[PDB]
Amino acid sequence: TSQVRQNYHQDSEAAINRQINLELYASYVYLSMSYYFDRDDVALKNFAKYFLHQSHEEREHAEKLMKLQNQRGGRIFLQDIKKPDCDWESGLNAMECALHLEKNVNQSLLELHKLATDKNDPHLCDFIETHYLNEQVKAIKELGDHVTNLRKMGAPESGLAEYLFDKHTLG
Amino acid sequence: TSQVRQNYHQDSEAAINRQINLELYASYVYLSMSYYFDRDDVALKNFAKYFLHQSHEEREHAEKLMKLQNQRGGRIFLQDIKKPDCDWESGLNAMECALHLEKNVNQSLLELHKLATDKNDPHLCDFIETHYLNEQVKAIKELGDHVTNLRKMGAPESGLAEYLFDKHTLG
Amino acid sequence: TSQVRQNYHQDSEAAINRQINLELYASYVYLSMSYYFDRDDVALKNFAKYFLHQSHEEREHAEKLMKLQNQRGGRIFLQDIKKPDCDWESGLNAMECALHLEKNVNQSLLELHKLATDKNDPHLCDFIETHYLNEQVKAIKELGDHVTNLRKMGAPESGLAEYLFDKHTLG
Amino acid sequence: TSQVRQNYHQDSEAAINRQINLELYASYVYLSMSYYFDRDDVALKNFAKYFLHQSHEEREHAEKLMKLQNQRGGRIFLQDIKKPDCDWESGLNAMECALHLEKNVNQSLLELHKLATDKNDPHLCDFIETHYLNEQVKAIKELGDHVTNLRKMGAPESGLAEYLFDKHTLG
Amino acid sequence: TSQVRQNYHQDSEAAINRQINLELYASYVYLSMSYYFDRDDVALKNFAKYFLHQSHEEREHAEKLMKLQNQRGGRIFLQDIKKPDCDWESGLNAMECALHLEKNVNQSLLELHKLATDKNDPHLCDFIETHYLNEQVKAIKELGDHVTNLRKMGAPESGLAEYLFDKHTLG
Amino acid sequence: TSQVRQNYHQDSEAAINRQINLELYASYVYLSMSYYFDRDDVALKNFAKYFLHQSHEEREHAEKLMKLQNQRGGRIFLQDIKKPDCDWESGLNAMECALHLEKNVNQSLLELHKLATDKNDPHLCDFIETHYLNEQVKAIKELGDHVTNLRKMGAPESGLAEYLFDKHTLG
Ligand SMILES: [Cl-]
Ligand SMILES: [Cl-]
Ligand SMILES: [Cl-]
Ligand SMILES: [Cl-]
Ligand SMILES: [Cl-]
Ligand SMILES: [Cl-]
Ligand SMILES: [Fe+3]
Ligand SMILES: [Fe+3]
Ligand SMILES: [Fe+3]
Ligand SMILES: [Fe+3]
Ligand SMILES: [Fe+3]
Ligand SMILES: [Fe+3]
Ligand SMILES: [Fe+3]
Ligand SMILES: [Fe+3]
Ligand SMILES: [Fe+3]
Ligand SMILES: [Fe+3]
Ligand SMILES: [Fe+3]
Ligand SMILES: [Fe+3]
Ligand SMILES: [Fe+3]
Ligand SMILES: [Fe+3]
Ligand SMILES: [Mg+2]
Ligand SMILES: [Mg+2]
Ligand SMILES: [Mg+2]
Ligand SMILES: [Mg+2]
Ligand SMILES: [Mg+2]
Ligand SMILES: [Mg+2]
Ligand SMILES: [Mg+2]
Ligand SMILES: [Mg+2]
Ligand SMILES: [Mg+2]
Ligand SMILES: [Mg+2]
Ligand SMILES: [Mg+2]
Ligand SMILES: [Mg+2]
Ligand SMILES: [Mg+2]
Ligand SMILES: [Mg+2]
């Protein structure tokens, strides 16, 4: 029992542990997407850099939830990080799968907030709002914008489209 | 139907469209107040600059709600911007009408927040808190302070009062 | 009756009030065009910035006519700002509608100048020439140039065209 | 009755007055703790500076709640500041009493937030979250860390422990 | 019994403890005066800053007497800080009450010096002369100067007077 | 079949995929060790920073083997990252477990080199020598040095030992 713990429910402590695992899974998916574009048979350098930066951001999102667990007096509990569920076939197909991943992560964060509201934990509500909810909203909007451009340009059939998008939008 | 929309109720999307129209109406009122003080028969230069800056701020408040509608996957819907409801007769009477306008805009924002709370939209609650609620509180306090000074100085009878307030408080 | 008024006809004072309303209407149309390109299903960032800058310019054109009314001893009279008359369907269709708007605003300014010539108001003629007539001529030429490029590139069918125009001409 | 007051309940106005008194009491306790370490029979200079800085922070927390009362149109109501409830016997015993004080102040702030939630005051909820709740969480964690180090080093029996902690952790 | 104590009488040690309490009471009175001028129904910003600076100075006067108690080998003994004895009704009435407070604090310091002279404590006499007696003389003179200006200007009836004093003398 | 592949055996391509998984496992172990020292009941800040830096280094070791797979024309194949096998009980016990981990990673790299020598792959031998073998030798030596210091200082019984090591060697 922690000398610092106060107003922190056991169900919130477990939900934070489940959230950490998800953030580490998203980092793994973005790492797989990055090295697919570094292959000699795909070769889109800016797509690779974009997905590698997204992988590093998800690892920072996980480390800050681990900081929070200890700040409130909970105890961290880790599980296996699952292999990504997948072949990426093109620049367009990868951005669409990244859009569905960020919407999944956003649904979990909204569920975590409902729980923290039921347990009357206002410090935890503000933590989630401050550091996670507008970041997901901005990230999902950006991926939607990217998917729209690739399609209007002629992807996935026009191989010229993904090459020029690589230079102008990601470059 | 929007590929980015998530946890965003149709009633919240309509209430945001109504909010935009109000912000544009406040910009119009402040523009009318500014050019009344630029008249040769009134001639208070610092009152004119103060009200013109307030007009530009309300236009920025409107553009950021239009940014938000698109971020969440809603669709903007515009209506006519009504002519201001009015003659401004003095520096004091104009500050009192500006105080009643900012309290009207604050009542609408509080209603928008109650709705967003009923629909369990925590990203929208935090958006309103972060960018709108303490700004209205600071603005209403400032106008109250200004009205109190003009009255204690002898306005609207002392024409010396509004001249000296123009130089010391707004100058 | 104004201690500063001289050689300033009542018909010129009313025509200036009508001109102000038009400038504010053009600002509203350009604001609607800007946020259409910020939508997740269109996503042309440079088209959005171009139309937002045009909206701010029309608001400056209106504020300077309000300055002029007071300089000559007239009195400002405001009316409702009408909702824009419209769906924008593409980058090309929006530039064509902007070209027709700037030609409408130019026809009103030419009518205002004919009136000021009939009333032998040479200060008002020079004001319109100095600050409004070559600006409309330059603006209409620019929009004509933009429309010509989009068509020759394959718009509105080639979705690649509007993407590349966004980067090279507006970027 | 205040020309600026809006959506601000009498029960919230009284609870804010009670909160101010508590913040001033915490400043007084930290001032007593500081000068105990400045005594010739204790002589821990860095312990004295640490507790004096904590006293100044609590006085800033009180002044900002007094600013808030006036911002919302309430009226400040002051009571006597009670003498601290105490002999501090060592560096360890003082950090443990500071940990219990910061947890008491946090329980009052959580009660104030529940009240503001019942009265549907969202500006007051965000004020408390922004400026008070993560500060208490960070402060309680820091004191827990300090207590743990002193005990593991051999306090309160090892007089070497508190001397070396003074130089390395607070120095 | 203190290894450092020398030529320091028990009656001087108790009189220093009583002096500390008074300095903390003066800080509390100046804090109440400051936030009265921050109210929306008074609104004199420079009066508020002046009284807040005076509150911080009285807290420094108290901390230096606590430093002195320990320097000479005495032991600090704290009592409750009483609520201020009061409604401030105007800028003039507040300066007059501040003038009577600083004369009360000066009478206590003169009594403390008589005692230190009877006990032949020359280090304590010089301490009081160096750090306290000319400061009270300068402070009382300044308040007398301020009261004289407000009255000659027409206070408390002329509300213009306190506004202009706020800008010129305190601004 | 890869247009760039040359002198690169299928058994080497699989052994590189197994090596990647191990590097990611070591990053996970070092991340768990870091947040154990950030707990309020342990509180060794420099131990936490040391283990977090080691976690980031192992992730860089993995990304460079993924770069190498693609450089030679192989294809990356990912597996689940296993949860760490463990309670860390003290600073000493954690350094000893880190020493055994780095010796395990070194045994795998030596096996990978024997295989690359059997298949006469000299580019792969030099890659492993250049970027991995002296790094493990330096890392194992450093951990041995750390374990020796903690024991000679009195760990795990002397809680003073791990505190002072935290400040002098890691600080
Ligand atoms: Cl708890
Ligand atoms: Cl939805
Ligand atoms: Cl005329
Ligand atoms: Cl109210
Ligand atoms: Cl003595
Ligand atoms: Cl081969
Ligand atoms: Fe991201
Ligand atoms: Fe994330
Ligand atoms: Fe404003
Ligand atoms: Fe607004
Ligand atoms: Fe233009
Ligand atoms: Fe124009
Ligand atoms: Fe603190
Ligand atoms: Fe506090
Ligand atoms: Fe918030
Ligand atoms: Fe003073
Ligand atoms: Fe004093
Ligand atoms: Fe002297
Ligand atoms: Fe390492
Ligand atoms: Fe490694
Ligand atoms: Mg599996
Ligand atoms: Mg935010
Ligand atoms: Mg009407
Ligand atoms: Mg909330
Ligand atoms: Mg804020
Ligand atoms: Mg209509
Ligand atoms: Mg010209
Ligand atoms: Mg008592
Ligand atoms: Mg915060
Ligand atoms: Mg009493
Ligand atoms: Mg003498
Ligand atoms: Mg002197
Ligand atoms: Mg297992
Ligand atoms: Mg080498």
Coordinates of N, CA, C and O in Angstrom, one line a residue, chain B residues 18-138:
Chain B
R18 N -24.3 27.4 -34.9 CA -25.0 28.6 -34.3 C -24.0 29.5 -33.6 O -24.1 30.7 -33.6
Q19 N -23.0 28.8 -33.0 CA -22.0 29.6 -32.2 C -21.2 30.5 -33.1 O -20.9 31.6 -32.8
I20 N -20.8 29.9 -34.3 CA -20.0 30.7 -35.3 C -20.7 32.0 -35.6 O -20.2 33.1 -35.6
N21 N -22.0 31.9 -36.0 CA -22.8 33.1 -36.4 C -22.7 34.2 -35.3 O -22.5 35.3 -35.6
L22 N -22.9 33.8 -34.0 CA -22.8 34.8 -32.9 C -21.5 35.5 -32.8 O -21.4 36.7 -32.5
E23 N -20.4 34.8 -33.0 CA -19.0 35.4 -33.0 C -18.8 36.4 -34.1 O -18.2 37.4 -33.9
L24 N -19.4 36.2 -35.2 CA -19.4 37.1 -36.3 C -20.3 38.3 -36.1 O -19.9 39.4 -36.5
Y25 N -21.4 38.1 -35.4 CA -22.2 39.2 -35.0 C -21.5 40.2 -34.0 O -21.6 41.4 -34.1
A26 N -20.8 39.6 -33.0 CA -20.0 40.4 -32.1 C -19.0 41.2 -32.8 O -18.8 42.4 -32.4
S27 N -18.3 40.7 -33.7 CA -17.3 41.4 -34.5 C -17.9 42.6 -35.2 O -17.4 43.7 -35.1
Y28 N -19.1 42.5 -35.7 CA -19.9 43.5 -36.4 C -20.2 44.7 -35.5 O -20.0 45.8 -35.8
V29 N -20.7 44.3 -34.3 CA -21.1 45.3 -33.2 C -19.9 46.2 -32.9 O -20.0 47.4 -32.8
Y30 N -18.7 45.5 -32.6 CA -17.5 46.2 -32.2 C -16.9 47.1 -33.3 O -16.3 48.1 -33.0
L31 N -17.2 46.7 -34.6 CA -16.8 47.5 -35.8 C -17.6 48.8 -35.8 O -17.0 49.9 -36.0
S32 N -18.9 48.7 -35.6 CA -19.8 49.9 -35.5 C -19.4 50.8 -34.4 O -19.3 52.0 -34.6
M33 N -19.2 50.2 -33.2 CA -18.7 51.0 -32.0 C -17.4 51.8 -32.3 O -17.3 53.0 -32.0
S34 N -16.5 51.1 -33.0 CA -15.1 51.8 -33.3 C -15.3 53.0 -34.2 O -14.7 54.1 -33.8
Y35 N -16.1 52.9 -35.3 CA -16.2 54.1 -36.2 C -17.0 55.2 -35.7 O -17.0 56.3 -36.2
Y36 N -17.8 55.0 -34.6 CA -18.6 56.0 -34.0 C -17.6 57.0 -33.3 O -17.8 58.2 -33.3
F37 N -16.5 56.4 -32.7 CA -15.5 57.3 -31.9 C -14.6 57.9 -32.9 O -13.8 58.8 -32.4
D38 N -14.6 57.6 -34.2 CA -13.7 58.2 -35.3 C -14.5 59.4 -35.9 O -13.9 60.1 -36.7
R39 N -15.7 59.6 -35.5 CA -16.5 60.7 -36.1 C -16.0 62.1 -35.5 O -15.5 62.1 -34.4
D40 N -16.1 63.1 -36.4 CA -15.6 64.5 -36.0 C -16.3 65.1 -34.8 O -15.8 66.0 -34.2
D41 N -17.5 64.6 -34.5 CA -18.4 65.1 -33.4 C -18.3 64.3 -32.2 O -19.0 64.6 -31.2
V42 N -17.4 63.3 -32.1 CA -17.1 62.4 -30.9 C -15.6 62.5 -30.7 O -15.2 63.0 -29.6
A43 N -14.8 62.0 -31.6 CA -13.3 62.2 -31.6 C -12.5 61.6 -30.4 O -11.8 62.3 -29.8
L44 N -12.7 60.3 -30.1 CA -12.0 59.7 -29.0 C -11.1 58.5 -29.7 O -11.6 57.4 -29.8
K45 N -9.9 58.9 -30.1 CA -9.0 57.9 -30.8 C -8.7 56.6 -30.1 O -8.7 55.6 -30.9
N46 N -8.5 56.6 -28.8 CA -8.2 55.3 -28.1 C -9.4 54.5 -28.0 O -9.2 53.2 -28.0
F47 N -10.6 55.0 -27.8 CA -11.8 54.3 -27.8 C -12.0 53.5 -29.1 O -12.4 52.4 -29.1
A48 N -11.7 54.2 -30.2 CA -11.8 53.6 -31.6 C -10.9 52.4 -31.8 O -11.3 51.4 -32.2
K49 N -9.6 52.6 -31.4 CA -8.6 51.5 -31.4 C -9.0 50.3 -30.6 O -8.8 49.2 -31.0
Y50 N -9.5 50.6 -29.3 CA -9.9 49.5 -28.4 C -11.0 48.6 -29.0 O -10.8 47.4 -29.0
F51 N -12.0 49.3 -29.6 CA -13.2 48.5 -30.2 C -12.8 47.8 -31.5 O -13.3 46.7 -31.7
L52 N -11.9 48.4 -32.2 CA -11.4 47.7 -33.5 C -10.6 46.4 -33.2 O -10.8 45.4 -33.9
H53 N -9.8 46.5 -32.1 CA -9.0 45.3 -31.7 C -10.0 44.2 -31.2 O -9.8 43.0 -31.5
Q54 N -11.0 44.6 -30.5 CA -12.1 43.6 -30.0 C -12.8 43.0 -31.2 O -13.0 41.8 -31.1
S55 N -13.1 43.7 -32.3 CA -13.7 43.2 -33.5 C -12.8 42.1 -34.2 O -13.4 41.1 -34.5
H56 N -11.5 42.4 -34.2 CA -10.6 41.4 -34.8 C -10.5 40.1 -34.0 O -10.4 39.0 -34.6
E57 N -10.5 40.2 -32.7 CA -10.5 39.0 -31.8 C -11.7 38.1 -32.0 O -11.5 36.9 -32.0
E58 N -12.9 38.7 -32.1 CA -14.2 37.9 -32.4 C -14.1 37.2 -33.7 O -14.6 36.1 -33.8
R59 N -13.5 37.8 -34.7 CA -13.3 37.1 -36.0 C -12.3 35.9 -35.9 O -12.5 34.9 -36.6
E60 N -11.3 36.1 -35.0 CA -10.4 34.9 -34.7 C -11.1 33.8 -34.0 O -10.9 32.7 -34.3
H61 N -12.0 34.2 -33.0 CA -12.8 33.2 -32.3 C -13.7 32.4 -33.3 O -13.9 31.2 -33.1
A62 N -14.2 33.1 -34.3 CA -15.1 32.4 -35.3 C -14.3 31.5 -36.2 O -14.8 30.4 -36.5
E63 N -13.1 31.9 -36.7 CA -12.3 31.1 -37.6 C -11.8 29.8 -36.9 O -11.7 28.8 -37.6
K64 N -11.5 29.9 -35.6 CA -11.1 28.7 -34.8 C -12.3 27.7 -34.6 O -12.1 26.5 -34.6
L65 N -13.5 28.2 -34.5 CA -14.7 27.2 -34.5 C -14.9 26.6 -35.8 O -15.3 25.5 -35.9
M66 N -14.6 27.4 -36.9 CA -14.7 26.8 -38.2 C -13.6 25.7 -38.4 O -13.9 24.7 -39.0
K67 N -12.4 25.9 -37.9 CA -11.4 24.9 -37.9 C -11.8 23.7 -37.2 O -11.6 22.5 -37.7
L68 N -12.5 23.8 -36.0 CA -12.9 22.7 -35.2 C -14.0 21.9 -35.9 O -13.9 20.6 -35.8
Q69 N -15.0 22.5 -36.5 CA -16.0 21.8 -37.2 C -15.4 20.8 -38.2 O -15.7 19.5 -38.2
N70 N -14.5 21.2 -39.1 CA -13.8 20.4 -40.0 C -12.9 19.3 -39.3 O -12.8 18.2 -39.8
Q71 N -12.2 19.7 -38.2 CA -11.3 18.7 -37.5 C -12.1 17.5 -37.1 O -11.6 16.4 -37.1
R72 N -13.4 17.7 -36.6 CA -14.2 16.6 -36.1 C -15.1 15.9 -37.2 O -15.8 15.0 -36.9
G73 N -15.1 16.4 -38.4 CA -15.8 15.8 -39.5 C -17.2 16.3 -39.7 O -17.9 15.7 -40.4
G74 N -17.6 17.4 -39.0 CA -18.8 18.1 -39.3 C -18.8 18.9 -40.6 O -17.8 19.0 -41.3
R75 N -19.9 19.6 -40.9 CA -20.0 20.5 -42.1 C -20.5 21.8 -41.7 O -21.5 21.9 -41.0
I76 N -19.8 22.9 -42.1 CA -20.1 24.2 -41.8 C -21.4 24.7 -42.5 O -21.6 24.3 -43.6
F77 N -22.2 25.5 -41.8 CA -23.4 26.0 -42.4 C -23.6 27.4 -41.9 O -23.7 27.7 -40.7
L78 N -23.5 28.3 -42.9 CA -23.5 29.8 -42.6 C -24.9 30.4 -42.8 O -25.7 30.0 -43.6
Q79 N -25.1 31.5 -42.0 CA -26.4 32.3 -42.1 C -26.0 33.7 -42.2 O -24.8 34.1 -42.0
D80 N -27.0 34.6 -42.5 CA -26.8 36.1 -42.6 C -26.2 36.7 -41.3 O -26.6 36.3 -40.3
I81 N -25.3 37.6 -41.4 CA -24.8 38.3 -40.2 C -25.6 39.6 -40.0 O -25.6 40.5 -40.8
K82 N -26.4 39.6 -39.0 CA -27.3 40.7 -38.7 C -26.7 42.0 -38.4 O -25.7 42.1 -37.8
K83 N -27.4 43.0 -38.9 CA -27.0 44.4 -38.6 C -27.0 44.6 -37.1 O -27.8 44.0 -36.4
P84 N -26.1 45.4 -36.5 CA -26.2 45.7 -35.0 C -27.5 46.3 -34.6 O -28.1 47.1 -35.4
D85 N -28.1 45.9 -33.5 CA -29.3 46.5 -32.9 C -29.2 47.9 -32.2 O -29.3 48.0 -31.0
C86 N -29.0 48.9 -33.0 CA -28.9 50.3 -32.4 C -28.9 51.4 -33.5 O -27.9 52.1 -33.8
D87 N -28.5 54.2 -31.1 CA -27.3 55.1 -31.3 C -26.4 55.1 -30.0 O -27.0 55.1 -28.9
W88 N -25.1 54.9 -30.2 CA -24.2 54.9 -29.1 C -24.2 56.4 -28.6 O -24.1 57.2 -29.5
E89 N -24.2 56.7 -27.4 CA -24.3 58.2 -27.1 C -23.1 58.7 -26.5 O -23.0 59.9 -26.5
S90 N -22.3 57.9 -25.9 CA -21.1 58.3 -25.1 C -20.1 57.1 -24.9 O -20.5 56.0 -25.2
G91 N -19.0 57.4 -24.4 CA -18.0 56.4 -24.0 C -18.5 55.5 -23.0 O -18.3 54.3 -23.2
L92 N -19.2 56.0 -22.0 CA -19.8 55.1 -20.9 C -20.9 54.2 -21.5 O -20.8 53.0 -21.3
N93 N -21.8 54.8 -22.2 CA -22.9 53.9 -22.8 C -22.4 52.8 -23.7 O -23.0 51.7 -23.7
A94 N -21.3 53.1 -24.4 CA -20.7 52.0 -25.3 C -20.1 50.9 -24.5 O -20.2 49.7 -24.8
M95 N -19.3 51.2 -23.4 CA -18.7 50.2 -22.6 C -19.8 49.3 -21.9 O -19.6 48.1 -21.7
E96 N -20.9 49.9 -21.4 CA -22.0 49.2 -20.8 C -22.6 48.2 -21.9 O -22.9 47.1 -21.5
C97 N -22.8 48.7 -23.1 CA -23.4 47.8 -24.1 C -22.4 46.7 -24.4 O -22.8 45.5 -24.7
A98 N -21.1 47.0 -24.4 CA -20.1 45.9 -24.7 C -20.1 44.8 -23.5 O -20.0 43.6 -23.8
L99 N -20.3 45.3 -22.3 CA -20.4 44.4 -21.1 C -21.6 43.4 -21.3 O -21.6 42.3 -20.9
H100 N -22.8 43.9 -21.8 CA -23.9 43.1 -21.9 C -23.8 42.1 -23.1 O -24.2 40.9 -23.0
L101 N -23.1 42.5 -24.2 CA -22.8 41.6 -25.3 C -21.9 40.4 -24.8 O -22.1 39.3 -25.2
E102 N -20.8 40.7 -24.1 CA -19.9 39.6 -23.7 C -20.6 38.7 -22.7 O -20.3 37.5 -22.7
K103 N -21.5 39.2 -21.9 CA -22.3 38.3 -21.0 C -23.3 37.4 -21.8 O -23.5 36.2 -21.5
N104 N -23.9 38.0 -22.9 CA -24.7 37.1 -23.8 C -23.8 36.0 -24.5 O -24.2 34.9 -24.5
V105 N -22.6 36.4 -25.0 CA -21.8 35.4 -25.6 C -21.4 34.3 -24.6 O -21.3 33.1 -25.0
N106 N -21.3 34.7 -23.3 CA -20.8 33.7 -22.3 C -22.0 32.7 -22.0 O -21.8 31.5 -21.9
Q107 N -23.2 33.2 -22.0 CA -24.4 32.3 -21.7 C -24.5 31.3 -22.8 O -24.8 30.1 -22.4
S108 N -24.3 31.6 -24.1 CA -24.4 30.6 -25.2 C -23.3 29.6 -25.0 O -23.6 28.4 -25.3
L109 N -22.1 30.0 -24.7 CA -20.9 29.0 -24.5 C -21.2 28.1 -23.3 O -20.8 26.9 -23.5
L110 N -21.8 28.5 -22.3 CA -22.2 27.7 -21.2 C -23.3 26.6 -21.6 O -23.2 25.5 -21.2
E111 N -24.3 27.1 -22.3 CA -25.2 26.2 -22.9 C -24.6 25.1 -23.9 O -24.9 23.9 -23.8
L112 N -23.7 25.6 -24.7 CA -22.9 24.6 -25.6 C -22.2 23.6 -24.7 O -22.2 22.4 -25.1
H113 N -21.6 24.0 -23.6 CA -20.9 23.0 -22.8 C -21.8 22.0 -22.1 O -21.5 20.9 -21.9
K114 N -23.0 22.5 -21.6 CA -24.0 21.6 -21.0 C -24.4 20.5 -22.0 O -24.3 19.3 -21.7
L115 N -24.6 20.9 -23.3 CA -24.9 19.9 -24.3 C -23.8 18.9 -24.6 O -24.0 17.7 -24.7
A116 N -22.6 19.4 -24.6 CA -21.4 18.5 -24.9 C -21.2 17.6 -23.7 O -20.8 16.4 -23.9
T117 N -21.5 18.0 -22.5 CA -21.5 17.1 -21.3 C -22.6 16.0 -21.4 O -22.4 14.8 -21.1
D118 N -23.9 16.4 -21.7 CA -24.9 15.4 -22.0 C -24.5 14.3 -23.0 O -24.9 13.2 -22.9
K119 N -23.8 14.7 -24.1 CA -23.5 13.8 -25.1 C -22.2 13.1 -24.8 O -21.7 12.4 -25.7
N120 N -21.6 13.3 -23.7 CA -20.4 12.6 -23.3 C -19.3 12.8 -24.4 O -18.7 11.9 -24.8
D121 N -19.1 14.1 -24.8 CA -18.1 14.5 -25.7 C -16.9 15.2 -24.9 O -17.0 16.4 -24.9
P122 N -15.9 14.5 -24.4 CA -14.9 15.2 -23.5 C -13.9 16.0 -24.3 O -13.4 16.9 -23.8
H123 N -13.6 15.6 -25.6 CA -12.8 16.5 -26.4 C -13.4 17.9 -26.6 O -12.7 18.9 -26.6
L124 N -14.7 17.9 -26.8 CA -15.4 19.2 -27.1 C -15.5 20.1 -25.8 O -15.3 21.3 -25.9
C125 N -15.7 19.5 -24.6 CA -15.7 20.1 -23.3 C -14.3 20.8 -23.1 O -14.3 22.0 -22.7
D126 N -13.2 20.1 -23.3 CA -11.9 20.6 -23.1 C -11.6 21.8 -24.1 O -11.0 22.8 -23.7
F127 N -11.9 21.6 -25.4 CA -11.8 22.6 -26.4 C -12.5 24.0 -25.9 O -11.8 25.0 -26.0
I128 N -13.7 23.9 -25.4 CA -14.4 25.1 -24.9 C -13.8 25.7 -23.7 O -13.6 26.9 -23.6
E129 N -13.4 24.9 -22.7 CA -12.7 25.4 -21.5 C -11.4 26.0 -21.9 O -11.1 27.1 -21.4
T130 N -10.5 25.3 -22.7 CA -9.2 25.8 -23.0 C -9.3 27.2 -23.8 O -8.5 28.1 -23.4
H131 N -10.1 27.3 -24.8 CA -10.0 28.5 -25.7 C -11.1 29.5 -25.5 O -10.9 30.6 -26.0
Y132 N -12.2 29.3 -24.7 CA -13.3 30.2 -24.6 C -13.7 30.7 -23.2 O -14.0 31.8 -23.0
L133 N -13.6 29.8 -22.2 CA -14.3 30.2 -21.0 C -13.6 31.2 -20.1 O -14.2 32.2 -19.6
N134 N -12.2 31.0 -19.9 CA -11.5 32.0 -19.2 C -11.3 33.3 -20.0 O -11.2 34.4 -19.4
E135 N -11.3 33.3 -21.3 CA -11.3 34.5 -22.1 C -12.5 35.3 -21.8 O -12.4 36.6 -21.6
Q136 N -13.7 34.7 -21.7 CA -14.9 35.6 -21.4 C -14.9 36.1 -20.0 O -15.3 37.3 -19.8
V137 N -14.4 35.3 -19.1 CA -14.3 35.8 -17.7 C -13.4 37.0 -17.6 O -13.7 38.0 -16.9
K138 N -12.2 36.9 -18.2 CA -11.3 38.0 -18.2 C -11.9 39.3 -18.9 O -11.7 40.4 -18.5

